[PDB]
Design a binder for this molecule. Structure first.
Ligand SMILES: NC[C@@H]1O[C@H](O[C@H]2[C@@H](O)[C@H](O[C@@H]3[C@@H](O)[C@H](N)C[C@H](N)[C@H]3O[C@H]3O[C@H](CO)[C@@H](O)[C@H](O)[C@H]3N)O[C@@H]2CO)[C@H](N)[C@@H](O)[C@@H]1O
Ligand SMILES: NC[C@@H]1O[C@H](O[C@H]2[C@@H](O)[C@H](O[C@@H]3[C@@H](O)[C@H](N)C[C@H](N)[C@H]3O[C@H]3O[C@H](CO)[C@@H](O)[C@H](O)[C@H]3N)O[C@@H]2CO)[C@H](N)[C@@H](O)[C@@H]1O
Ligand SMILES: NC[C@@H]1O[C@H](O[C@H]2[C@@H](O)[C@H](O[C@@H]3[C@@H](O)[C@H](N)C[C@H](N)[C@H]3O[C@H]3O[C@H](CO)[C@@H](O)[C@H](O)[C@H]3N)O[C@@H]2CO)[C@H](N)[C@@H](O)[C@@H]1O
Ligand SMILES: NC[C@@H]1O[C@H](O[C@H]2[C@@H](O)[C@H](O[C@@H]3[C@@H](O)[C@H](N)C[C@H](N)[C@H]3O[C@H]3O[C@H](CO)[C@@H](O)[C@H](O)[C@H]3N)O[C@@H]2CO)[C@H](N)[C@@H](O)[C@@H]1O
Ligand SMILES: NC[C@@H]1O[C@H](O[C@H]2[C@@H](O)[C@H](O[C@@H]3[C@@H](O)[C@H](N)C[C@H](N)[C@H]3O[C@H]3O[C@H](CO)[C@@H](O)[C@H](O)[C@H]3N)O[C@@H]2CO)[C@H](N)[C@@H](O)[C@@H]1O
Ligand SMILES: NC[C@@H]1O[C@H](O[C@H]2[C@@H](O)[C@H](O[C@@H]3[C@@H](O)[C@H](N)C[C@H](N)[C@H]3O[C@H]3O[C@H](CO)[C@@H](O)[C@H](O)[C@H]3N)O[C@@H]2CO)[C@H](N)[C@@H](O)[C@@H]1O
Ligand SMILES: [Mg+2]
Ligand SMILES: [Mg+2]
Ligand SMILES: [Mg+2]
Ligand SMILES: [Mg+2]
Ligand SMILES: [Mg+2]
Ligand SMILES: [Mg+2]
Ligand SMILES: [Mg+2]
Ligand SMILES: [Mg+2]
Ligand SMILES: [Mg+2]
Ligand SMILES: [Mg+2]
Ligand SMILES: [Mg+2]
Ligand SMILES: [Mg+2]
Ligand SMILES: [Mg+2]
Ligand SMILES: [Mg+2]
Ligand SMILES: [Mg+2]
Ligand SMILES: [Mg+2]
Ligand SMILES: [Mg+2]
Ligand SMILES: [Mg+2]
Ligand SMILES: [Mg+2]
Ligand SMILES: [Mg+2]
Ligand SMILES: [Mg+2]
Ligand SMILES: [Mg+2]
Ligand SMILES: [Mg+2]
Ligand SMILES: [Mg+2]
Ligand SMILES: [Mg+2]
Ligand SMILES: [Mg+2]
Ligand SMILES: [Mg+2]
Ligand SMILES: [Mg+2]
Ligand SMILES: [Mg+2]
Ligand SMILES: [Mg+2]
Ligand SMILES: [Mg+2]
Ligand SMILES: [Mg+2]
Ligand SMILES: [Mg+2]
Ligand SMILES: [Mg+2]
Ligand SMILES: [Mg+2]
Ligand SMILES: [Mg+2]
Ligand SMILES: [Mg+2]
Ligand SMILES: [Mg+2]
Ligand SMILES: [Mg+2]
Ligand SMILES: [Mg+2]
Ligand SMILES: [Mg+2]
Ligand SMILES: [Mg+2]
Ligand SMILES: [Mg+2]
Ligand SMILES: [Mg+2]
Ligand SMILES: [Mg+2]
Ligand SMILES: [Mg+2]
Ligand SMILES: [Mg+2]
Ligand SMILES: [Mg+2]
Ligand SMILES: [Mg+2]
Ligand SMILES: [Mg+2]
Ligand SMILES: [Mg+2]
Ligand SMILES: [Mg+2]
Ligand SMILES: [Mg+2]
Ligand SMILES: [Mg+2]
Ligand SMILES: [Mg+2]
Ligand SMILES: [Mg+2]
Ligand SMILES: [Mg+2]
Ligand SMILES: [Mg+2]
Ligand SMILES: [Mg+2]
Ligand SMILES: [Mg+2]
Ligand SMILES: [Mg+2]
Ligand SMILES: [Mg+2]
Ligand SMILES: [Mg+2]
Ligand SMILES: [Mg+2]
Ligand SMILES: [Mg+2]
Ligand SMILES: [Mg+2]
Ligand SMILES: [Mg+2]
Ligand SMILES: [Mg+2]
Ligand SMILES: [Mg+2]
Ligand SMILES: [Mg+2]
Ligand SMILES: [Mg+2]
Ligand SMILES: [Mg+2]
Ligand SMILES: [Mg+2]
Ligand SMILES: [Mg+2]
Ligand SMILES: [Mg+2]
Ligand SMILES: [Mg+2]
Ligand SMILES: [Mg+2]
Ligand SMILES: [Mg+2]
Ligand SMILES: [Mg+2]
Ligand SMILES: [Mg+2]
Ligand SMILES: [Mg+2]
Ligand SMILES: [Mg+2]
Ligand SMILES: [Mg+2]
Ligand SMILES: [Mg+2]
Ligand SMILES: [Mg+2]
Ligand SMILES: [Mg+2]
Ligand SMILES: [Mg+2]
Ligand SMILES: [Mg+2]
Ligand SMILES: [Mg+2]
Ligand SMILES: [Mg+2]
Ligand SMILES: [Mg+2]
Ligand SMILES: [Mg+2]
Ligand SMILES: [Mg+2]
Ligand SMILES: [Mg+2]
Ligand SMILES: [Mg+2]
Ligand SMILES: [Mg+2]
Ligand SMILES: [Mg+2]
Lengths: 49, 223, 159, 58, 148, 51, 185
RNA sequence: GGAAUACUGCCAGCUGGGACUGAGGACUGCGACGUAAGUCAAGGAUGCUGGCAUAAUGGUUAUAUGCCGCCCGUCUUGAAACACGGACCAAGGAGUCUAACGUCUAUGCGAGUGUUUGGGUGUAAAACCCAUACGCGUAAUGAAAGUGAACGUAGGUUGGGGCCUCGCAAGAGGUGCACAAUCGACCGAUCCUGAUGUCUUCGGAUGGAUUUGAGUAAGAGCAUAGCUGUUGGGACCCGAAAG
RNA sequence: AAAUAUGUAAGAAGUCCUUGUUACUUAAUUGAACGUGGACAUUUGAAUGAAGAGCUUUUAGUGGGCCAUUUUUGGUAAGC
RNA sequence: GCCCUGAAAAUGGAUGGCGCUCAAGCGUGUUACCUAUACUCUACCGUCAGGGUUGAUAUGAUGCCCUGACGAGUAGGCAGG
């Protein structure tokens, strides 16, 4: 309902949002593996920058 | 150092010896002051009787009020009054200077208290046994005139009988001399209240009202 | 249905006195009101314009404004627990001149003139008022007045 | 169903706990609701009596 | 954390802190902003006046940065000159070699008129300056150059 | 630490009001008073005993 | 039983030590608690109380607020005391010398205090130089300048500002905000 | 006519019996008795004698006796109720997490603040490090085009702690930050006046105004965090007839 | 025309003396406010009390009530 | 005045109960006496308030010490555990 003196918020969570939710636990491995993916490119690509 | 602190002590010891002389002075002068006055009044009655006329005494300037009712179920206006007279607890009492200002504070309070005109003894034994004083809150027993003088000294009143005098004689500093006094915590009457039922007026059933001189027999038994 | 409109219940209240009616005399119009004046509020039924609401009848306040035909009066009324500040725009037929403070001035002024008597003599002042007192001892003369003694009267029917 | 309608019971009590306050007055009250052409001219009477002390002190 | 939370204090007391008469139900009053015009009227006026209805004019496909005018005041100004040089330029007070301050390249592009500045002159490179701003720059013996 | 009660415990009776010593010595709570011979006006016994 | 004319077992609203755990802050208090007790100096009492204050009650005292206070007549040379952190203000230009005893000084504050040739004293140093706090000028930052204090007491006709998340038109300007839509406030 | 006696009242008059209590733990106090040495009942019990280790005494527990004591939990104005749940025991069993927030508090830095989108780096989800941006704050106000905060030591009057001057003091004088009341100035909006100029309709100087703003007037904020409170969420737990 | 209940005052923000401002006001140095400079404290201007005075933010529960004396309405009355 | 008539209801039954007749009844007076978680005095626990104190010499400055007042509680809040 509506009480006290508080700004009106808008929270769009009526939609089954708990279905589409992405945590990034992979931020580590999606970097460690984002590096190794670049590291071996330049390897395979040889002096080119 | 041994001489220096000895100088404070040897002089202070002498300051007190003389400060106690000021007292014996006054209290002996107080003893005459009362002894003559009552003797005056006692005589003036007899004279007027020999003259055919009647000595009509001065109405009483000083009254002692002990609250005989509990703290429950009291109407607001009496309830506020009992607080302003500093009786918030059963069987407690204060002194009141009689004036048509405070006289109306009584009589409005009449349902919840018994009161009357206290004697010298009654005041003396009330202050001697039950006498306390107010120093930054802090209910403090008057065990020494130093306590009194430290506080009531700015008014005179360096004795405990200086307090007693300033009360019974009323007089200029009675407001602060009486207000200095903590309200008197008293026991129930030793030997009962004399009535069956307290909350009929003294004239009808006993207690609860102005019993005039009969306040002394009561208060003394509550002491 | 309940009826709460502005002047309800004022029937006897806004009535003019028995054998006083019609035009209001000129002392009312000829009075001067500056700011700070303490005025008593009593409505007048003959004058409908600029009259107090029935509440402020009997109340006394300090005029905060002076206009052509009226004076604004600030009054203190309680709502819930507090006093808010009401200010009324009232005409002069509804305004008295309060005698509450008037004597206090005649008190101060007499107090300062009795101060010069302790300045020119040096006796004690006794300025602040003291309430009525226990009285005093006296002697009542039996000369020419000897107490006459009464008893209670019996019962008898008077009709 | 039917129930209570109104009462003032206990309201004096509630309004005396923290209650009844006081008008909390100050010196120099607000001028709210005073004649405009007083409070207009009153500005310039004070605007002018300013310069009087913007001279005297030097 | 939980061990700090009052609902551990309430273990053992019937009804948590929620009351015996009114309990804690699902949705008394209705979910969300329901009834703002009716039973919540008193709360929408008082703490959110103006909440209902329309005011003014719409804008279709409005894109900010058509409006971009970060605001800067003579109140600052000289901050845009690095600290040490700021000294000797204030010491100079020259109409011959005088410091150049490019406001737009400094994160800005409207110069306002708040607050006093020294008599030391400034070359103000800007766009959109306020009338009182400039005139106060003329008191320092300096100019404004409009750019884009 | 302990309030003692000048109505008993002579020591504190003397600690306050040193006049107590005199008062005791002189009796003075037993003080006799000068005898008077005054007799009431015969009107006063007329009213008193009257009716 | 007593009829109580005031509420039993009520505690006074004032703090005693701070709520902060900072071990150095707790020491400065141990200092100035001792000071305020064994002196006649009222200044020590004042500083002691101000040591318990909360970051909302110790708003930053700007250097320009210090400067203008030295332009006070007769206070020119006094060492000024701020029981909270002191901020730099670029808005001034010529800033006098003095010395300023505070808890903390921002980097700009400190360095620019010394450019004018003045000291940043730390509160115990100030205590040793001035055990009775003599020739000291105490300064306070504004506590009603705060954001949250703008929304306090938000009624009809109170001209305060509402708790509001976005802002612009479309947001709380229509019904109740003008005579044209509903009423106005 | 001279007492006596009753009655009421005062004595800082003298004495006998009983009861409960012995808190404190060097000395500091106020006193009293003293010619004095000194003594004391004077800011809280010491002296003396006896009795007890197969134990006196104290704890628990069972039983008895005197008096007392209705079943909890719940709703309710009112329950022991002829109101509802509960035959018993063990285990399980109900205000959570999330996103956005209000007050308050602690902390970092402060006219700024936020490393963690990303990059570097690594003893590899850690820790350490960093460019460009971005977010919020540093300007408001109009619906909008727009315009955009110093007449004055950033004001006047009245209060104000602290600091200062003389004063034993008591007071007095001085400065007066936060803060309170109030009179002003300033920025925007609204209405009014409409200058020098202009390509004749542009430009809007100056000066008013019971109008107005979530503004200015030697900045306070940004960030991580705790309790409590708000909303969206299965949303304290269990429960419909239905669709 | 009561009783009871009820608004106001009992001071240093006081009572006065003088005379500067203004666009208001007057026949007008008439006023009105607001100032400048100055006269007076010692019961500082009733009693009584004050367990301290003022201020701010936030937030729980509650929003079925019932009883006694008294005043009181409907009802023959009621544990209405 | 007291008492009597007036004065008829359903299980057996209630001045609370036995029972009381110059009362152990009714009206009135005067004293003694009994005992509440109330009043007075004191010990102890806690809460709130005021004051002293690391000038120290260990072992706690959130301490140690002195003083005064106070203590009902559902829904509910907060604190210390
Ligand atoms: N407003 C959006 C964002 O909200 C964030 O909110 C953070 C806090 O406000 C929030 O705290 C909530 C609190 O709001 C709420 N009223 C009480 C709750 N106990 C707190 O939650 C906290 O404690 C719980 C219990 O251990 C933890 O599990 C939780 O991770 C922790 N944040 O935890 C949030 C982080 O998970 C931040 N305020 C900020 O990043 C930003 O404002
Ligand atoms: N009359 C001496 C005065 O001393 C003042 O300064 C000293 C003291 O008088 C004053 O003491 C406090 C004061 O801090 C506080 N803000 C008010 C407080 N009433 C004052 O206390 C004063 O009054 C109380 C009560 O009567 C007395 O117990 C105390 O001895 C006395 N100094 O604070 C200073 C010491 O800390 C002022 N210099 C000035 O008013 C005047 O010179
Ligand atoms: N600082 C970041 C910027 O902030 C903006 O918001 C700030 C301002 O731009 C915004 O003001 C709006 C503005 O959005 C819009 N384009 C024009 C409008 N007239 C302005 O509104 C202005 O006046 C209204 C009353 O009319 C006030 O309510 C409002 O506070 C005021 N800023 O109000 C905010 C200041 O209070 C944008 N919301 C945001 O997207 C952007 O990133
Ligand atoms: N009942 C008399 C009262 O006197 C009061 O007057 C008090 C104040 O107005 C007056 O204060 C003056 C102040 O006006 C002036 N602008 C500064 C001056 N230093 C102050 O002086 C006062 O305070 C200082 C500082 O603590 C003390 O040293 C000094 O003793 C004291 N007179 O000092 C008086 C207190 O001594 C008020 N006018 C009012 O509350 C009331 O009329
Ligand atoms: N309007 C300008 C103002 O006029 C003021 O003067 C006008 C009044 O205020 C002034 O009157 C003074 C008054 O100021 C002061 N406070 C009291 C004094 N009793 C008055 O005096 C007045 O009464 C006396 C007789 O009682 C007459 O003789 C006299 O003419 C009359 N003006 O007399 C003028 C006309 O009545 C002052 N000069 C000054 O404040 C200012 O210049
Ligand atoms: N101890 C019994 C006494 O009688 C009282 O109660 C009495 C009344 O309840 C009852 O009186 C009723 C009357 O109400 C109803 N009309 C029926 C019956 N015939 C009457 O009975 C009466 O009879 C005559 C008078 O009529 C009397 O002499 C007689 O004493 C009385 N009992 O008779 C009871 C016994 O006399 C009380 N129980 C008690 O307080 C009192 O002490
Ligand atoms: Mg009398
Ligand atoms: Mg009294
Ligand atoms: Mg009288
Ligand atoms: Mg007995
Ligand atoms: Mg009895
Ligand atoms: Mg009896
Ligand atoms: Mg006795
Ligand atoms: Mg006794
Ligand atoms: Mg009607
Ligand atoms: Mg009439
Ligand atoms: Mg009449
Ligand atoms: Mg009309
Ligand atoms: Mg209904
Ligand atoms: Mg009903
Ligand atoms: Mg209802
Ligand atoms: Mg109805
Ligand atoms: Mg409260
Ligand atoms: Mg816990
Ligand atoms: Mg619990
Ligand atoms: Mg339980
Ligand atoms: Mg509960
Ligand atoms: Mg349960
Ligand atoms: Mg709760
Ligand atoms: Mg429940
Ligand atoms: Mg509810
Ligand atoms: Mg909308
Ligand atoms: Mg004791
Ligand atoms: Mg108690
Ligand atoms: Mg301010
Ligand atoms: Mg402000
Ligand atoms: Mg407004
Ligand atoms: Mg916003
Ligand atoms: Mg419309
Ligand atoms: Mg309309
Ligand atoms: Mg004879
Ligand atoms: Mg004879
Ligand atoms: Mg006798
Ligand atoms: Mg003897
Ligand atoms: Mg012992
Ligand atoms: Mg001795
Ligand atoms: Mg001797
Ligand atoms: Mg001797
Ligand atoms: Mg000796
Ligand atoms: Mg032995
Ligand atoms: Mg046993
Ligand atoms: Mg039983
Ligand atoms: Mg139930
Ligand atoms: Mg039910
Ligand atoms: Mg029911
Ligand atoms: Mg209930
Ligand atoms: Mg009912
Ligand atoms: Mg039950
Ligand atoms: Mg039943
Ligand atoms: Mg049920
Ligand atoms: Mg059941
Ligand atoms: Mg069943
Ligand atoms: Mg079951
Ligand atoms: Mg069952
Ligand atoms: Mg079973
Ligand atoms: Mg938060
Ligand atoms: Mg990894
Ligand atoms: Mg940035
Ligand atoms: Mg303009
Ligand atoms: Mg100008
Ligand atoms: Mg000012
Ligand atoms: Mg001032
Ligand atoms: Mg003095
Ligand atoms: Mg225009
Ligand atoms: Mg202008
Ligand atoms: Mg600001
Ligand atoms: Mg909170
Ligand atoms: Mg289900
Ligand atoms: Mg289904
Ligand atoms: Mg359907
Ligand atoms: Mg003039
Ligand atoms: Mg008092
Ligand atoms: Mg609330
Ligand atoms: Mg509610
Ligand atoms: Mg309900
Ligand atoms: Mg009923
Ligand atoms: Mg009933
Ligand atoms: Mg009945
Ligand atoms: Mg029968
Ligand atoms: Mg029988
Ligand atoms: Mg009986
Ligand atoms: Mg029988
Ligand atoms: Mg029988
Ligand atoms: Mg019996
Ligand atoms: Mg009898
Ligand atoms: Mg007997
Ligand atoms: Mg007990
Ligand atoms: Mg303490
Ligand atoms: Mg309790
Ligand atoms: Mg309680
Ligand atoms: Mg409890
Ligand atoms: Mg509970
Ligand atoms: Mg514990």
């Amino acid at each position: 309902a509506i009480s006290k003196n508080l700004p009106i918020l808008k929270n769009h969570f009526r939609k089954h949002w708990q279905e589409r939710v992405k945590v990034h636990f992979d931020q580590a491995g999606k970097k460690v593996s984002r590096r190794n993916a670049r590291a071996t490119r330049a390897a395979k690509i040889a002096p080119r920058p | 150092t041994a001489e220096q602190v000895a100088a404070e002590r040897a002089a202070r010891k002498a300051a007190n010896k003389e400060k106690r002389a000021i007292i014996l002075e006054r209290n002996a002068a107080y003893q005459k002051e009362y002894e003559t006055a009552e003797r005056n009044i006692i005589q003036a009655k007899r004279d007027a009787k020999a003259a055919g006329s009647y000595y009509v005494e001065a109405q009483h300037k000083l009254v002692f009020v002990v609250r005989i009712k509990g703290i429950n179920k009291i109407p607001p206006k009496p309830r506020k009054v009992l607080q302003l007279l500093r009786l918030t607890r059963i069987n407690s009492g204060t002194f009141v200077k009689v004036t048509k200002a405070t006289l109306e504070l009584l009589k409005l309070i009449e349902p919840y208290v018994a009161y009357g005109y206290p004697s010298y003894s009654t005041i003396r034994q009330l202050v001697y046994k039950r006498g306390f004083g107010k120093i930054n809150k802090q209910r403090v027993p008057l065990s020494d005139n130093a306590i009194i003088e430290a506080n009531l000294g700015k008014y005179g009143i360096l004795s405990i009988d200086d307090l007693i005098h300033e009360i019974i004689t009323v007089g200029p500093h009675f407001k602060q001399a009486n207000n200095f006094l903590w309200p008197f915590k008293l026991s129930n009457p030793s030997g009962g209240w004399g009535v069956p039922r307290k909350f009929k007026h003294f004239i009808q059933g006993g207690s609860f009202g102005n019993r005039e001189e009969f306040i002394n027999k009561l208060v003394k038994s509550m002491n | 249905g309940k009826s709460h409109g502005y002047r309800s219940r004022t029937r006897y209240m806004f009535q003019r006195d028995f054998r006083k009616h019609g035009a209001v005399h000129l002392s009312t119009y000829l009075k001067v009101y500056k700011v700070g004046d303490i005025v008593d509020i009593k409505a007048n039924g003959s004058i409908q314009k600029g009259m107090p609401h029935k509440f402020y009848q009997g109340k006394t306040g300090v005029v905060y404004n002076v206009t052509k035909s009226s004076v604004g009066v600030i009054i203190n009324k309680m709502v819930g627990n507090r006093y808010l500040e009401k200010r009324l725009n009232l005409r002069v037929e509804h305004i008295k001149h309060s005698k509450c403070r008037q004597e206090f001035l005649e008190r101060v002024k007499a107090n300062a003139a009795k101060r010069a008597e302790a300045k020119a003599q040096g006796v004690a002042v006794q300025l602040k008022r003291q309430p009525a007192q226990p009285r005093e001892s006296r002697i009542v003369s039996t000369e020419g007045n000897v107490p006459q003694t009464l008893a209670p009267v019996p019962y008898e029917t008077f009709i | 169903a039917k129930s209570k309608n109104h009462t003032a019971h206990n309201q004096t009590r509630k309004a005396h706990r923290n209650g009844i306050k006081k008008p909390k007055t100050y010196k120099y009250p607000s001028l709210k609701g005073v004649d405009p052409k007083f409070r207009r001219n009153h500005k310039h009477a004070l605007h002018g009596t300013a310069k009087a002390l913007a001279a005297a002190k030097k | 954390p939980s061990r700090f939370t009052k609902t551990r204090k309430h273990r053992g007391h019937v009804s948590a802190g929620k009351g015996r008469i009114g309990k804690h139900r699902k949705h008394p009053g209705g979910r969300g902003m329901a009834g703002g015009q009716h039973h919540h009227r008193i709360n929408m006026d008082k703490y959110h006046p103006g909440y209902f209805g329309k005011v003014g004019m719409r804008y279709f496909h409005k894109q900010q940065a058509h409006f971009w005018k970060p605001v800067l005041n003579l109140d600052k100004l000289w901050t845009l000159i690095p600290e040490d040089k700021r000294d000797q330029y204030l010491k100079s007070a020259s109409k011959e070699t005088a410091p150049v301050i490019d406001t737009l390249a400094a994160g800005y592009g409207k110069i306002l008129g708040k607050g006093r500045i020294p008599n030391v002159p400034v070359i103000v490179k800007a766009r959109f300056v306020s009338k009182l701003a400039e005139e106060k720059i003329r008191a320092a013996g300096g100019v404004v150059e409009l750019i884009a | 630490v302990l309030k003692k009660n000048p109505l008993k415990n002579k020591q504190v009776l003397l600690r306050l009001n040193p006049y107590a010593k005199v008062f005791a010595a002189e009796k003075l709570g037993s003080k006799k008073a000068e005898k008077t011979g005054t007799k009431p006006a015969a009107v006063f016994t007329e009213t008193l005993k009257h009716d | 039983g007593i009829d109580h004319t005031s509420k039993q077992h009520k505690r006074s609203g004032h703090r005693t030590a701070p709520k902060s755990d900072n071990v150095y802050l707790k020491l400065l208090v141990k200092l100035y608690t001792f000071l305020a007790r064994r002196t006649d100096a009222p200044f020590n009492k004042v500083v002691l109380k101000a040591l318990f204050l909360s970051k909302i009650n110790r708003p930053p005292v700007s250097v320009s607020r210090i400067a203008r206070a030295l332009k006070q007549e007769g206070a020119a040379n006094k060492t000024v005391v701020v029981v909270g952190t002191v901020t730099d203000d670029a808005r001034i230009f010529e800033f006098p010398k003095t010395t300023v005893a505070a808890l903390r000084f921002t980097a700009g504050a400190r360095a620019k205090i010394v450019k004018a040739g003045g000291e940043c004293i730390t509160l115990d140093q100030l205590a040793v130089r001035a055990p009775k706090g003599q020739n000291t000028l105490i300064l306070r930052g504004p506590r009603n300048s705060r954001e949250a204090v703008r929304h306090f007491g938000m009624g009809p006709h109170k001209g305060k500002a509402p708790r509001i998340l976005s802002t612009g038109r479309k947001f709380e300007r229509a019904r109740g905000r003008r005579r044209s839509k509903g009423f106005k406030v």
